[PDB]
């Protein structure tokens, strides 16, 4: 937060970059992976897409019907 | 004891290795400094965190490994960085 | 030339061309407003530094 | 004629739109030249116009008043606004150190009413009379001369009905909801758990509409094994402060504190005795007639048809609250895509509850 040294008064804000986020945890925004990279998992793939990708990829379908999406 | 020098030394390794090819970069007792510790999250010094960023990005993506090699050494295999245990980091054992 | 402490003492100029980033626990400061790169002297030259805590947008020195 | 009429309206609108923007800039720059103030806490009262305080920006300094300053409300430990130049007390501020609306969870009213906690109506009738009744009308007890209970201990299996009852008490009231996570209570700092309870104790006295809810006190409580301390000092630090604030000369009339744990027998027996905690209430599984009102709430948000049967689950449901029925709606939500329908049949309710009944009780 912006604080004046001499006046001890807030004037303009400050850009937030390093918040002491507790680093050493990998943050990868929008990685590149596909379920077709490994075959034979289609039995497990159909279970992961419906329980994770399905409530996410379509936002408006589950919100209009009032269906809460599982968070894990 | 100097914090921040480890990130510069590792970066200078791959930059110098491109000048003279057909070289092998070896690391002894990586558990001394450590690949994973409790000082990364709790502590205020940045050494291994910035070292792993320069280790994975510089070597793997744009740098061919034919004439450039990186070999580590350790004692307890379970005390290393779990980021390296994932596929796409360390294969030959 | 290794320098492990980058701090000034009571340096105030203007608005623009002030900077004075202090790594000491007392009176920390940050600099916003885009990217600013200088070949040699940023503000006072010399003690200008970063060390362990990266302050905003300044890599080059 | 009509050419100048269109430009006349566009010229007037551009003036009024920019006038509100220029007036804010002129008003903001006037507040940027104001002088800040210091902050300190009163240690001991020296004299009338002279005080002995301890500033938070440095060492202690002798202070005073200036003009139109109330000296009756200034007591020991009261945070005061110290002047920079004259070094006197100007404004009056409450007693706070760490933010209680950020580090401590603060919430107003509630998102879960008392109709979704149904099935507990045996306990609900008791809880409302010992909480809602004394809080809204405490003066009825002063005529008889009795005292209302302070804390309310609600134990049981974790995760079932605990989140619902937390917001349900503050929903029927509308007061502040103070949540105290057991993780942030035990830390390594200077005066960690002491300042958490004391400032919460003072914030509850200064602001009457405040409800404190504790979750999983077994970490901060417990008898341990030999009652010895090895890195255990934070457990006794929290327990001893809770019992000391209640039996002191300052009690909490309108303040209610709700605690939760895994087992009541694993806690400190000193708290369970009367005089501090007068309320010990078990939270068992709800009955069959109480789960019908729950199934008409969460399923109402889920899009369905008019032929949906609400009596299909009540036969196959055993102790299923609003948290467990949402798992049935998750499986029912994925089924509507396979059959290309916007609703679910009444048979989907029986198959979803039967799957949960195998894992649960």
DSSP one-letter string for C3-53: -S----SS------S------SSSS-----SS----SS-SSS-TT---TTS
Describe the strand order of the beta sheet including D105-108 as a list of residue ranges: D105-108, D176-181, D210-215, D256-259, D151-155, D277-282
Establish whether D160 is an annotated binding residue: yes
User: What CA–CA distance (Å, rounded) separates B3 from C51?
Assistant: 7
The total number of residues written for chain B in this structure = 93
What's the gap in Å between the CA of C16 and the closest CA on chain B? 29
Contact A15 C12 (CB under 8 A): no
Establish whether D163 is an annotated binding residue: yes
What's the gap in Å between the CA of C60 and the closest CA on chain A? 18
Which technique? cryo-EM
Among D280, D258, D336, D343, residue whose Cα is nearest residue D307: D343
Entry resolution (Å)? 4.2
Using a CB-CB cut-off of 8 Å, the residues of chain B touching C4 are 2
What's the gap in Å between the CA of B17 and the closest CA on chain A? 27
Contact D303 A9 (CB under 8 A): no
User: What CA–CA distance (Å, rounded) separates A10 from A14?
Assistant: 10
**Which residue matches tokens 């965190």?**
B49
Contact (CB, 8 A) for B39 and B45: yes
Using a CB-CB cut-off of 8 Å, the residues of chain C touching A15 are 30, 32, 56
Contact D303 A51 (CB under 8 A): no
Q: Mutate which of D25, D28, D31, D32 to test chain A, going by most A C-beta atoms within 10 A?
A: D32
Using a CB-CB cut-off of 8 Å, the residues of chain A touching C27 are 5
Establish whether D159 is an annotated binding residue: yes
- Six token digits for residue D162: 């605990």
Strand (E) or helix (H) holding D176: strand D176-181
Strand (E) or helix (H) holding D304: none
Contact B49 A23 (CB under 8 A): yes
Among C43, C38, C1, residue whose Cα is nearest residue C22: C43
Using a CB-CB cut-off of 8 Å, the residues of chain C touching A8 are none
User: What CA–CA distance (Å, rounded) separates D349 from D307?
Assistant: 12
Using a CB-CB cut-off of 8 Å, the residues of chain C touching A6 are 12
- Six token digits for residue D249: 């000369």
Contact (CB, 8 A) for D123 and D283: yes
**Which residue matches tokens 């994770």?**
A52
Please indicate if any CB of chain A lies within 8 Å of the CB of C34: no
Residues in A lying within 8 Å of B, measured between beta carbons? 22-26
Strand (E) or helix (H) holding D186: none
Identity of the residue in A6, A15, A18 whose CB atom sits nearest the CB atom of C32? A15
Contact (CB, 8 A) for D28 and A11: no
Helices D347-359 & D322-338 angle (0-180, nearest 10)? 130
DSSP state, residue A68: P
User: What CA–CA distance (Å, rounded) separates C46 from B67?
Assistant: 40
Count chain A–chain C contacts defined by CB atoms under 8 A: 12
Contact A50 D334 (CB under 8 A): yes
């Amino acid at each position: 937060v912006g604080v004046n040294k001499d006046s001890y008064l807030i004037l303009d804000t400050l850009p937030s970059e390093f918040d002491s986020r507790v680093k050493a945890m990998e943050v990868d925004e929008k990685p590149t992976e596909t379920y077709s990279d490994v075959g034979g998992l289609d039995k497990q793939i159909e279970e992961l897409v419906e329980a994770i990708v399905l409530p996410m990829k379509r936002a408006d379908k589950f919100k209009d019907m009032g269906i809460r999406a599982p968070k894990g | 004891k100097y914090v921040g020098e480890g990130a510069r030394m590792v970066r200078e390794l791959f930059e110098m290795a491109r000048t003279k090819k057909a070289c092998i970069i070896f690391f002894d007792e990586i558990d001394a400094v450590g690949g994973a510790r409790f000082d990364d999250g709790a502590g205020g010094d940045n050494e291994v965190q910035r070292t792993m960023l320069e280790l994975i990005t510089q070597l793997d993506g744009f740098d061919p490994r034919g004439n450039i090699k990186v070999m580590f050494a350790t004692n307890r295999p379970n005390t290393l960085d779990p980021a390296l245990l994932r596929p796409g980091r360390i294969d030959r054992k | 030339h290794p320098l492990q402490v980058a701090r000034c003492t009571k340096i105030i100029k203007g608005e623009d061309a002030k900077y004075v980033i202090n790594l000491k626990q007392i009176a920390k400061f940050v600099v916003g407003l885009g990217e600013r790169v200088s070949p040699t002297d940023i503000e006072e030259g010399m003690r200008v530094g970063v060390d362990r805590s990266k302050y905003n947008i300044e890599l080059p020195l | 004629h009509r050419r100048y009429d269109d430009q006349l309206k566009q010229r007037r609108q551009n003036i009024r739109d920019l006038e509100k923007l220029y007036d804010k800039t002129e008003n903001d720059i006037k507040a940027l030249q104001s002088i800040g103030q210091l902050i300190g806490e009163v240690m001991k009262e020296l004299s009338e116009e002279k005080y002995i305080v301890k500033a938070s920006s440095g060492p202690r300094y002798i202070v005073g008043v200036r003009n139109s300053v109330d000296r009756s409300k200034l007591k020991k430990g009261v945070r005061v606004t110290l002047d920079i130049t004259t070094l006197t007390i100007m404004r009056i501020l409450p007693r706070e150190t760490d933010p209680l609306v950020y580090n401590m969870t603060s919430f107003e009213q509630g998102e879960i009413t008392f109709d979704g906690i149904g099935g507990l109506t045996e306990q609900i009738r008791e809880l409302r009379e010992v909480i809602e009744l004394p809080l809204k009308n405490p003066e009825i007890f002063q005529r008889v001369g009795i005292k209302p209970p302070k804390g309310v201990l609600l134990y049981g299996p974790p995760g079932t009905g605990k989140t619902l009852l937390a917001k349900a008490v503050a929903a029927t009231i509308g007061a502040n909801f103070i949540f105290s996570p057991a993780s942030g209570i035990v830390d390594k700092y200077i005066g960690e758990s002491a300042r958490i309870i004391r400032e919460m104790f003072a914030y509850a006295k200064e602001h009457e509409p405040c409800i404190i809810f504790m979750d999983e006190v077994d970490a901060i409580g417990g008898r341990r094994f030999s009652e010895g301390t090895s890195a255990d000092r934070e457990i006794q630090r929290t327990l001893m402060e809770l019992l000391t604030q209640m039996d002191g000369f300052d009690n909490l009339g309108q303040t209610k504190i709700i605690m939760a744990t895994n087992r009541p027998d694993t806690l400190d027996p000193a708290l369970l005795r009367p005089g501090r905690l007068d309320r010990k209430v078990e939270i068992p599984l709800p009955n069959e007639a109480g789960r019908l009102e729950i199934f008409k709430i969460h399923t109402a948000k889920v899009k369905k048809t008019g032929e949906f049967d609400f009596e299909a689950a009540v036969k196959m449901s055993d102790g299923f609250n609003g948290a467990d029925i949402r798992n049935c709606a998750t499986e029912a939500g994925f089924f509507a895509i396979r059959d290309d329908r916007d609703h679910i049949n009444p048979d989907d309710l029986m198959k979803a509850v039967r799957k949960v009944a195998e894992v649960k009780k």
